[PDB]
Amino acid sequence: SGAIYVGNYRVVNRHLATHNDWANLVWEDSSRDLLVSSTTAQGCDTIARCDCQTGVYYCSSRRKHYPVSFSKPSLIFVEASEYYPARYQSHLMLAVGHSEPGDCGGILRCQHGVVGIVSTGGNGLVGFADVRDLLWLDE
């Protein structure tokens, strides 16, 4: 589980979005596995605006933060699940590391701020949905 709270926005994985997220929907993209909903309370997480290829992500299934090198966001094939058919997920960044289904929504950060959130996993590779191109989040 896990979300980013920046201004009056809540950024979550779309396959994990709640009834309230959909009743307060702002933007959603099935190919990115992202949904942004509106909040009443203000948030103050900082989104990173950079092209860093190193960072640290929280892995709940180990209660640990791991430093990883990850790929630039791109079109990556994803196996069929109970949420999506077989497809290409865009804006996915991959790193070699541990993840379990429950680790989805864990945040990946660099010295500037939030890079993105855990969205895909398995085979010793953890995938992160990038959020740095979504400039509208900061206003």
Candidates 26, 52, 76, 78; binder of ligand A1BQH (CB under 6 A) is 78
Tokens matching residue 97: 């590391």
52: helix, strand or coil: coil
Q: Which of 16, 26, 78, 110 binds Zn ion (CB under 5 A)?
A: 110
| Residue 68 sits in the site that holds ligand A1BQH (CB under 6 A) | no
- Residue 37: which of ligand A1BQH, Zn ion, none does it interact with, CB under 5 to 8 A by kind? none
Considering only residues 16, 52, 56, 125, which one is a binding residue for Zn ion as defined by CB under 5 A? 52
Dihedral sign, Cα of residue 105, residue 110, residue 115, residue 118: negative
Q: Could you say which of 97, 113, 116, 121 contacts ligand A1BQH (CB under 6 A)?
A: 121
CA atoms within a 13 Å half-sphere pointing along the CA-CB vector of 125: 11
Please report whether residue 89 would count as binding ligand A1BQH according to CB under 6 A.
Answer: yes
For the chain, report the end-to-end CA distance as a whole number of angstroms: 25
Q: Is 134 exposed, middle or buried (0-12, 13-18, 19+ CB in 10 A)?
A: buried
- Give dist(CA 81, CA 44) in Å, integer: 33
Copy the structure tokens of residue 51.
Answer: 């092209």
Residue 98 annotated among the catalytic residues of the structure = no
Nearer to Zn ion, 26 or 52 (CB): 52
Site residues for ligand A1BQH per CB under 6 A: 15, 33, 78, 81, 83-84, 89, 99-101, 103-104, 118-122, 126
**Which are the catalytic amino acids?**
15, 33, 104
